[PDB]
Nucleic acid binder design. Structure first.
Lengths: 63, 97, 63
RNA sequence: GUCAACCGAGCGUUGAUCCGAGGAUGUCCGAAUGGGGAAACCCGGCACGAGUGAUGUCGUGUCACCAGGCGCUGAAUAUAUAGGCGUCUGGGGGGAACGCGGGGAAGUGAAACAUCUCAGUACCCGUAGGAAGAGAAAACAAAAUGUGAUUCCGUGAGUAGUGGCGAGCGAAAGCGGAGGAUGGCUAAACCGUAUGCAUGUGAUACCGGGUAGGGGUUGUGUGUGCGGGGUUGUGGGACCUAUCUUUCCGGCUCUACCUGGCUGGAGGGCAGUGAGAAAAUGUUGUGGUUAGCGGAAAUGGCUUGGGAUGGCCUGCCGUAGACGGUGAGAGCCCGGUACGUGAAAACCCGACGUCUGUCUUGAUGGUGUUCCCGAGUAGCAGCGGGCCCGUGGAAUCUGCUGUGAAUCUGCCGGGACCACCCGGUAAGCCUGAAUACUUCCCAGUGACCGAUAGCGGAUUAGUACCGUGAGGGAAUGGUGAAAAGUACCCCG
RNA sequence: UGCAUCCGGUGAAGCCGCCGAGUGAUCGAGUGGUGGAGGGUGUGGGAGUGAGAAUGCAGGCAUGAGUAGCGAUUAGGCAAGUGAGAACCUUGCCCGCCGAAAGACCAAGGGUUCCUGGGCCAGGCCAGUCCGCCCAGGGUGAGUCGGGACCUAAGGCGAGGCCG
RNA sequence: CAUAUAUCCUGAGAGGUGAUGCAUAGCCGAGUGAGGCGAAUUCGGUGAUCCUAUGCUGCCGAGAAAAGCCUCUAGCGAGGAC
């Protein structure tokens, strides 16, 4: 999800999306540890989604 | 704007014969963040898995030092949490056997 | 001992010349005196270090 | 990303990777600063949030010290102050060279050695700035009707000199250049005002005169602040005092009338972030910097060769025949080169403005007198430092200790000193350029090195290793054009 | 290295020979082999320009020499096994040694040496199938044990402060 | 008012419980190695450098601090103790 429509959500759904992406990252980490998921790029993508949401929140807070 | 979740304290499970022997006892081993305490780990596990936690045991391990053609290198040190659940005992399936 | 609390006068440095003209380093200290001054006509007395030139100039109010 | 691949997964013409600018995040240590500590790891307070049945737990802010402002309080103790409390603004540390101010060796030379040299070096301490320091004559000079702040460069000159007259050390005047700002502001005498501290003929006293009030623009002092005014050497300036006078309006000089001065408002200027007062804010400059883009001409023929970029022979471009790469010497194959072009944003230089300060309550050249012209200062004496000058007949400059002046017919200097002439005006402050340097960045260069050389370091380099520690400190480059890095068989 | 000429993948330099040459340092646009990219000559310019020796320095290698030694004062043997390979590794049975230790457990110090599996070029003073060696993975669980969150000693640092 | 083997405090050890448990000589098998069952346990002697004991006695050389613990008030208090 690009920052474009990421800037359309309000603060509450932005926090919710951050939460859900964090749980997704947790599940992916456990799957990698047990070694069953193939797509290694999922971890990178989810980490960057978290970073993007944090950036948008900080931009809004700073103005 | 920090959003603290319980899921960054817990990093990964430990997969080993000792870990599995403990799991058949309903005792689980995790790799946790090096700067977390026992009660924080217990709270995080309770929140994540919606279970009742009896006790948490923690051990620090130094990373192994290895030799290379460039010289000596060290692996990262980890902290391990050994978590025992209550008698209600709904197994943590996310451990993936 | 060597620094005036009023005017900042400090020790000079020179040589000590013997008859055989052997020159050895020595110091020239100021004539620093401990004087109980009266800063204000209220009467508070504080022990300060003043050179005798400062006493001569009336700069230290030993009232 | 790379060593450095081997996989495994994936992204990209809906613009990725990549390059430039501006933002966000930024664990812990470190000036390290909530407290402690064996640096990188221990333990907290307060406020607000999260979580829990509650304790536990988590997140975000904030909590060092000192200095200087402001406000509150004011011990012994009375005035009060020290101190205390609160709140704002700074500081702290690092850095290669260059700067300034202090402290300050020895080896060495003198064929010994102490004066002397080495050397104000090494080193150390305190402090900066992009440069610093110095700087606007109490200067030189020598009778020239002479120069005219400072700095730096060349001469003067290894000279005059100085020196156990040993070894050695060593100017300046003048002259030729770089750069120019022969630059600015103050303190005092006097006015006005405000205030602190004393008092007060407490009235005939203070406005500029004439008139009329009045018992305080205090009446008198003194101190301080503020604003005027005054910045000088042929002396200058206040105090006077004539003459001449280039905006308008308003309010004041105890009070009103007619006269002289202080103060606001309109033009008109004049200056500017400048040393000469200061913080800003706008518009503009194919002005600059920080990524880039375009850019001519041979698939040419024959021959050698694994390969042509070799040899011979044909063309072509050239504002481009710089330099590299490409399978061997390439202007025409590639990157490029000459030459053109390009900035959303940020920053840096300019410019024009808002803006600010400032003069216009102003200016001129004249006449004779009192006051002012930087004080524990100059000078002198004792003991030192440094000047060509090593105490010498020792001037000029300077530190400590004593003593200690004058304000212009005053003072200082012209190498002891005196008289006369000449020059200048100390004890207040700022000041650009010419000059020094390179941690770092960019673009280049070499009758420089080419792996025991060149940096210690072309390779794990301040690494391995050595030492308790400060510290010391290496060695190690080249297959091939391409890995095409020898399938398969045999001995083992 | 300036300038001018000439040679070169049809094979430069360097190296190893042969055959010759000069009064000397030396030479060979004479030649063969090896090799794979630059050289020669003339005339000028400049040198990090010539080594045999400094108890010279670095690297490589001789002589002594297949010589000394192979690190205590206990001692090993046999059978079977594994294996390409066994005096040394495994198992068994003997024998011997320590036993106020050569047994067991801590502190300091060390740092993964511990366990499992694999390996056998380097190391182990011989060999090695073995190993404190090499490679991979695994392994250290505290309200009560030792420390901190409790307290102080010597001593350290030290707000202000005094001294310089 | 008291001289008491009174009373209280400290305190090795014996005894009880902990312990219908746990462990064990052995015995069955099973064979890397896992498993099941499991007797009796009295009574004496000797004897510590360990405990009572930071005790007691003697001596001179005259032998940490703070926390902790207890108590006292000052002080908080309408709720608080078991």
């Amino acid at each position: 999800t690009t920052p474009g429509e990421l800037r359309e959500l309000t603060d509450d759904e932005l926090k919710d999306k951050l939460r859900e992406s964090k749980e997704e990252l947790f599940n992916l980490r456990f799957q990698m540890a047990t070694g069953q998921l193939s797509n290694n790029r999922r971890l990178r993508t989810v980490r960057q989604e978290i970073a993007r949401v944090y950036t948008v929140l900080r931009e809004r807070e700073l103005g | 704007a920090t959003i603290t979740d319980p899921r960054d304290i817990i990093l990964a499970p430990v997969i080993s014969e000792k870990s599995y022997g403990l799991i058949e006892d309903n005792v689980y081993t995790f790799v946790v963040h090096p700067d977390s305490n026992k009660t924080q780990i217990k709270i995080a596990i309770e929140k994540i898995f919606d279970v009742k936690v009896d006790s948490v045991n923690t051990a620090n391990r130094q990373g192994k030092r290895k030799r290379t053609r460039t010289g000596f290198g060290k692996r990262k040190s980890t902290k391990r949490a050994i978590v025992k659940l209550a008698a209600g005992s709904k197994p943590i399936d996310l451990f993936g056997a | 001992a060597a620094v005036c609390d009023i005017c900042g006068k400090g020790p000079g440095f020179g040589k000590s010349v013997s008859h055989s003209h052997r020159r050895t380093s020595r110091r020239w200290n100021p004539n620093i005196q401990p004087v109980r001054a009266v800063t204000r006509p209220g009467g508070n007395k504080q022990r300060i270090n003043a050179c005798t030139s400062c006493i001569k100039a009336g700069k230290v109010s030993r009232a």
